[PDB]
């Protein structure tokens, strides 16, 4: 089971537009954003108090250099693929997710995945240990990267050794924030329109992201008729979600919502209270 995760999302665009710099690299610990580089500011900077108070100057400085290097590599990568796919100019995007997970058995998973204009380009995983090309333009990259095993050795040492060592440092630094449990505030709402009552069970303000939200109809579970929203983010670092159902107005009182969360003394039960 995954216990902790360190990952970075890189977004590089060929054409800056409002609210999209040329390059942004963001770091997450257990999903929580904690560090950021962008081509406007030109510096790695802390997004949490805990990494600010635990980091030193050389931490920010050393990562600035890689962010600057990555920015320039992506500019070159964007021109390479445009020329390779003989594409139109204008807006193109290279995305990269990479990082590691620490499992309950003490073991490490890691990977690096790149995307181009919304599809798989090339990917790497510690399980298989070789670059996978999604199409024939990526095959050219795969061949160059596999030469003398050089890039696969750097990726492996980073994802298998450096990444989990730094994850363990950050888990310490962030222990308080990471460990906390705020339970949901649950409410059921009811729009009784078109002859057809719609019933929504909303869980507000919960951390972490794991939650069970299930509609009941008498003694039955009602998934067949249930629709769930995503588990989506609040501005304050907590989560929101909802399970919905359609009911006849007459039978509205047969239905109740069950919600379990780690911050819960016990599983809770909720109904429409007009």
């Amino acid at each position: 089971m995954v216990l902790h995760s360190l990952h970075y999302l890189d977004v590089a665009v060929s054409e800056p537009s409002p609210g999209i710099p040329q390059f942004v690299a963001m770091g997450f610990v257990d999903g929580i954003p904690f560090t950021r580089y962008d081509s406007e500011r030109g510096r790695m900077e802390p997004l949490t108090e805990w990494i600010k108070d635990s980091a030193d100057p050389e931490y920010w400085d050393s990562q600035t250099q890689i962010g600057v290097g990555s920015q320039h590599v992506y500019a070159r990568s964007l021109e390479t693929l445009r020329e390779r796919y003989n594409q139109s100019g204008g807006l193109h995007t290279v995305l990269r997710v990479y990082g590691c997970e620490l499992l309950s058995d003490g073991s490490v998973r890691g990977s690096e995945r790149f995307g181009y204009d919304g599809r798989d380009f090339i990917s790497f995983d510690l399980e298989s240990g070789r670059f996978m090309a999604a199409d024939s333009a990526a095959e050219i990259t795969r061949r160059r990267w596999e030469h003398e095993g050089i890039v696969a050795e750097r990726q492996t040492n980073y994802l298998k050794h450096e990444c989990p060592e730094w994850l363990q440092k950050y888990v310490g630094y962030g222990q308080k924030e990471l460990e906390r449990k705020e339970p949901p505030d649950v409410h059921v709402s009811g729009k009784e329109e078109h002859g057809t009552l719609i019933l929504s069970c909303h869980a507000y303000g919960f951390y972490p992201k794991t939650i069970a939200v299930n509609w009941m109809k008498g003694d039955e579970i009602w998934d067949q008729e249930t629709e769930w929203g995503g588990v989506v983010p609040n501005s304050d670092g907590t989560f929101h979600t909802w399970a919905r159902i359609e009911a006849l107005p007459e039978e509205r009182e047969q239905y109740r919502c069950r919600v379990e969360h780690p911050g819960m003394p016990e599983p809770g039960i909720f109904a429409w209270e007009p």
Binding site: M44, I66, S70, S77, F121, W145, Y158, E162
Partner: peptide, 9 residues
């Protein structure tokens, strides 16, 4: 620790 620079395609 963001020290895995992108490699050019």
């Amino acid at each position: 620790y963001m020290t895995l620079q992108a490699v050019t395609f």
